[model samples]
Target: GHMSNGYEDHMAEDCRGDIGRTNLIVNYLPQNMTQDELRSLFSSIGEVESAKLIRDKVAGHSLGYGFVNYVTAKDAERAINTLNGLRLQSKTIKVSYARPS
Candidate 1:
């Protein structure tokens, strides 16, 4: 039922499902890196729940950017602190929030 005896019991507090999980956007990714590779990179900093490196659908090429989702928002904060401006393959990578706060 949509409503119950009342008192904020419907949908509850955390029962509304996961509303805020920190997702990140990584830029300046090297062309040589694959999705799994990207995962490993961020995985090292934190437990990565998911990682995706955007590719050119037509030519199947790297887009130099990707998204990484962390198991916890805290991990994203930690990962960003450690990985932003981090260099890889002669390019300094940039990491930031995928969605604005």
Candidate 2:
């Protein structure tokens, strides 16, 4: 399960200021990642505001794409540069800035 930030009411003043304001797009993920695993893996590159492992309700497998919102754009870039192409379970990760609203 995804843990709450635990201070959502004061997020704008507290946790929000601790990280950047950038949204990142990640694709090509393996089909077996849990929320904890996804969070653990991507958080290393930056402060991950959120990490969603898209799954099919019928079979409960990853759809190979997901979204991670970084606190800052810098951290997002760091992830795209350093984390992208990282081999995990034999699949190279694909990461970049998410486009548009």
Candidate 3:
């Protein structure tokens, strides 16, 4: 959680207590991608409550990972079903439900 860039706090207290179940940890992201691009991509799968791409605190570059929070459990699972391991920006992304602290 130390490198979450504000997302750690968002996950800590937001989303109607559905953070762990409805949010996803996305790995293997393209480094150059923006938060809006990430959010837009996940939007095709469901109504995204929140989307964030973790970046360096000072350098401000993507950390090659992100989080996406969905409005429903089904949509979250559906996103995992459709996007996990799918190739994007020449990388295969891994998507899974975030673990609760």
Candidate 4:
């Protein structure tokens, strides 16, 4: 679940068909990028519903990894196929659909 002020909640109300399930994980993220920056960058490819970069709570910064959810499955698939390993900021970001565990 997401906080009321969170992007997940916002995505539910947005009818742009740019979001999907409430889960994601992007690999090979840049060492210095933040979750917000990832969201902004992904938005260019399509609608980035919500992004939460995994961080070392103790380190206080991006952990060179992250996750982002789209409001529609279509968008997620598209992002994965098109942007996975796409270079940005000198690193190749690996976008993919998170598998069921």
User: Model 2, 1-101: lDDT tens per residue?
Assistant: 55333222232453343344477667777777665555667799868888777789859688876777778788877777787776756776677666533
Give the best candidate by TM-score.
3
TM-score to native of every candidate shown: 0.71, 0.72, 0.74, 0.69
- Colliding pairs, model 1: none
Name the lDDT value of residue 25 in candidate 3.
71
Give the per-residue lDDT digits (tens) of candidate 3, residues 1-101. Answer: 55554233233555343544788777767787777867777888879899888889859688888888878767777777787776777777666666555
Model 1 Cα lDDT, one tens digit per residue, 1-101 = 85332222112434322345467677767776778877788898979999999889858677888888888777776666788677766666666556434
Q: TM-score for model 2?
A: 0.72
* lDDT, model 2: 0.67
lDDT of 4 by residue, 1-101 (tens): 44222223223444333334434567778888888877866776677778888778867566776878777677776676677777767888877654324
Q: Give the runs in model 2 whose Cα sits over 4 Å from its true position.
A: 1-21
Off by over 4 Å in 3: 1-20
Report the poorest 10 consecutive residues by lDDT, candidate 1.
Answer: 3-12
Which pairs of residues collide in model 4? 19-70, 19-71, 19-72, 20-70, 20-71, 20-72
